[PDB]
Amino acid sequence: APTPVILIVEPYGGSIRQQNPNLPMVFWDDAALTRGDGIFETLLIRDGHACNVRRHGERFKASAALLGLPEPILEDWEKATQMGIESWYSHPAGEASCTWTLSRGRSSTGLASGWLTITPVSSDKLAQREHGVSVMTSSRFDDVIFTDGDRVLEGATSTVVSFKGDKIRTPSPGTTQAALFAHATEKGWRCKEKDLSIDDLFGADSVWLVSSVRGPVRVTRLDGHKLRKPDNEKEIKALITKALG
Amino acid sequence: APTPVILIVEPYGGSIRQQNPNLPMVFWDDAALTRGDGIFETLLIRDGHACNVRRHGERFKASAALLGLPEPILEDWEKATQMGIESWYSHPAGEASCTWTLSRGRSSTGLASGWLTITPVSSDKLAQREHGVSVMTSSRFDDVIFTDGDRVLEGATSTVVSFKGDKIRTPSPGTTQAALFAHATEKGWRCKEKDLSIDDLFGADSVWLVSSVRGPVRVTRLDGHKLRKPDNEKEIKALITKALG
């Protein structure tokens, strides 16, 4: 069992400190504990770097602006992430999950609280990369695809992606879609958002759930029935993994 | 500025420990920090006791059952609260606010996290007890009364209570309404839930916002206009304060 790496990221250009995972870290009056404002952003770590860091950085800033939190200084968050990555791989280490957390902070100090955690990618996610997910359709083993009757919305914590020939389609609503469409378009794929239906999913060459850390997982079941197997499955798995890298 | 009193309440009949408010308390992998399940219940402290503790206890258990959290052992929570109260008044002291927090706990241990905090009733709440609240009507200085057109729903963090003669009325949907109706009925008041309208509020003798800690506050403004002043205002303030005591 690998040891998690935890770093405290002080706001307003403050210190970056290592946190012992076996000691407490958050105070009683932190907004994170008192139903106050907090945001998070989760990134994949592979081979000495944080993946798709610029898009994750932009989204973390947008989340902070929405809640009226102090604007995160991305240079500090990215520097702390890299220090955490170097500590993680200096031991002894495979892919990791990095979550950035920012809260409004302690009510007694008025300073935001920020930290990141680096942990191994779960065995559940690695197995699903190789074997797939059983999906459940629901109004607005082991995921949920939200629907509005026949219309497809999104995965529980992921983006639905369908493939048909050289066409890539996603439902009309993220960091996943932007990275996938930018890389897939460069490779000749024809990408577009569409008002997807359940029939479109049953008629597609393949249906996938895609997210930053779990990466691409094939949808083998949607309430039932075997969703076929494409001749280009290996190529698609490599395409999406590279796009999110 | 009084020192907060914090106690850790271990689940499954574990230890009750004092927490230093100036030292960290919560670990990185607690459900309270990782968007996991947590509940809270807030109680008023006055003259050596927790007010309306049985009803707060019942609600805390109902909240835990809803989220599938381990059933709180109320004897342990009430004993820890009393220890906290005794520490609070042994110094060095007026009314206090006590919040019970229960989370699913650390993912690495599988044991729920529980703690309580005792802090002074805020000066904002004490001033509003004496001077009132300016209310805003909104769809589903300084509060919000939710509405559905002309229908009255509830306060932002309180119960709307109207008075007209010997009649007490609340909107049809809590610990506040049950304590108020039980005590007011014993004193001859005629209590009922009703599909209240904005017109009912403008036509009432008085309109109040009532909650466990702030207690009864008069509604002097609802988007505008002076909401009169009853001859029995002193009596009503005493009635509701006693009901919630």
Which technique was used to obtain these atomic coordinates? Answer: X-ray
| Count: domains in chain A | 2
**Which of B17, B28, B113 is the mutation pick for testing A, counting most A CBs within 10 A?**
B28
- Are B28 and A32 a contacting pair at CB < 8 A? no
**Nearest-Cα residue of chain B relative to residue A1:** B108
Same structural domain, A233 and A146: yes
Contact A162, A201 (CB under 8 A): yes
Q: Which of B21, B26, B101 is closest, CB to CB, to A25?
A: B26
Quick check: B19 contacting A, CB < 8 Å? yes
- Are B25 and A27 a contacting pair at CB < 8 A? yes
The residue ranges of DSSP E strands in B106-183, in sequence order, are 113-120, 133-139, 142-148, 151-155, 159-164, 167-171
Same structural domain, B231 and B221: yes
Same structural domain, B136 and B151: yes
DSSP A153-207: EEESSSEEEEEETTEEEEE---HHHHHHHHHHHHTT-EEEEE--BHHHHHHSSEE
CATH number at residue B216: 3.20.10.10
Same structural domain, B59 and B169: no
Distance CA B49, CA A22 (A): 36
Q: Which domain holds residue A139?
A: 122-245
- Are B27 and A21 a contacting pair at CB < 8 A? yes
- CA A166-A168-A170 angle, to 5 degrees, is 165
Same structural domain, B205 and B90: no
Same structural domain, A9 and A127: no
- HSE (CB half, 13 Å, CA atoms) of A12? 8
Residues 6 or more apart in contact with residue B147 via CB below 8 angstroms:
B137, B138, B139, B140, B153, B198
State the residue for tokens 């916002």.
Answer: B209
* Shortest Cα distance, chain B CAs vs residue A30, angstroms: 10
Quick check: B88 contacting A, CB < 8 Å? no
Q: Which two tokens stand for residue A170?
A: 């996603």
Same structural domain, A137 and A56: no
- Are A117 and B28 a contacting pair at CB < 8 A? yes
CA dihedral A78, A82, A85, A87 (to 10 degrees): -130
Distance CA A54, CA A64 (A): 15
**Nearest-Cα residue of chain A relative to residue B21:** A28
Same structural domain, A115 and A177: no
Same structural domain, A115 and A187: no
- Are A33 and B32 a contacting pair at CB < 8 A? yes
Residue A47 region by backbone torsions, left for phi larger than 0, else alpha for psi between -120 and 50, else beta:
left
CATH number at residue B80: 3.30.470.10
Contact B208, B221 (CB under 8 A): no
State the residue for tokens 């997982």.
Answer: A217
Quick check: A62 contacting B, CB < 8 Å? no
- Are A24 and B29 a contacting pair at CB < 8 A? no
Among candidate residues A121, A146, A181, the one where a domain is terminated: A121
Quick check: A2 contacting B, CB < 8 Å? no
Quick check: B238 contacting A, CB < 8 Å? no
Distance CA A119, CA A4 (A): 5
- Using the Cα atoms of residue A160, residue A162, residue A168 and residue A170 in order, give the sign of their dihedral: negative
Distance CA A222, CA A201 (A): 9
- Using the Cα atoms of residue B124, residue B130, residue B136 and residue B141 in order, give the sign of their dihedral: negative
Which own/partner pairs from B11-18 qualify as long-range (CB within 8 Å, at least 24 positions apart)? Answer: B11/B70, B11/B72, B11/B73, B11/B105, B11/B111, B11/B112, B11/B114, B12/B70, B12/B73, B12/B111, B13/B73, B13/B76, B16/B76, B16/B79, B16/B80, B16/B83, B18/B87
Quick check: A28 contacting B, CB < 8 Å? yes
- Using the Cα atoms of residue A50, residue A54, residue A59 and residue A63 in order, give the sign of their dihedral: positive
* Cβ neighbours around B102 below 10 Å, total: 27
* Shortest Cα distance, chain A CAs vs residue B182, angstroms: 31
Quick check: B58 contacting A, CB < 8 Å? no
Distance CA A205, CA B73 (A): 54
Residues 6 or more apart in contact with residue B225 via CB below 8 angstroms:
B202
CA distances from A132 to A1, A96, A137 (A): 25, 20, 16
Contact B162, B204 (CB under 8 A): yes
State the residue for tokens 């935890």.
Answer: A6
Same structural domain, B129 and B59: no
Same structural domain, A64 and A168: no
First to last CA, chain A: 25
Same structural domain, A30 and A114: yes
Pairing of strands A142-148, A133-139: parallel
Host H or E run for residue B129: helix B123-131
Contact B60, B32 (CB under 8 A): no
What is the structure's resolution, reported in angstroms to one decimal? 1.6
CA distances from A215 to A4, A49, A93, A210 (A): 21, 16, 18, 5
- Are A115 and B23 a contacting pair at CB < 8 A? no
Q: Which residues of B touch A107 (CB under 8 A)?
A: none
Distance CA A66, CA A60 (A): 10
Among candidate residues B68, B91, B121, the one where a domain is terminated: B121
Among candidate residues A92, A121, A150, the one where a domain is terminated: A121
Sheet architecture: strand order including B16-19 = B16-19, B5-9, B113-120, B96-103, B38-46, B49-50
Quick check: B20 contacting A, CB < 8 Å? no
- Are B6 and A21 a contacting pair at CB < 8 A? no
Contact A113, A32 (CB under 8 A): yes
Contact B142, B136 (CB under 8 A): no
Q: C-alpha B155: how far from its chain's center?
A: 12
Contact B17, B7 (CB under 8 A): yes
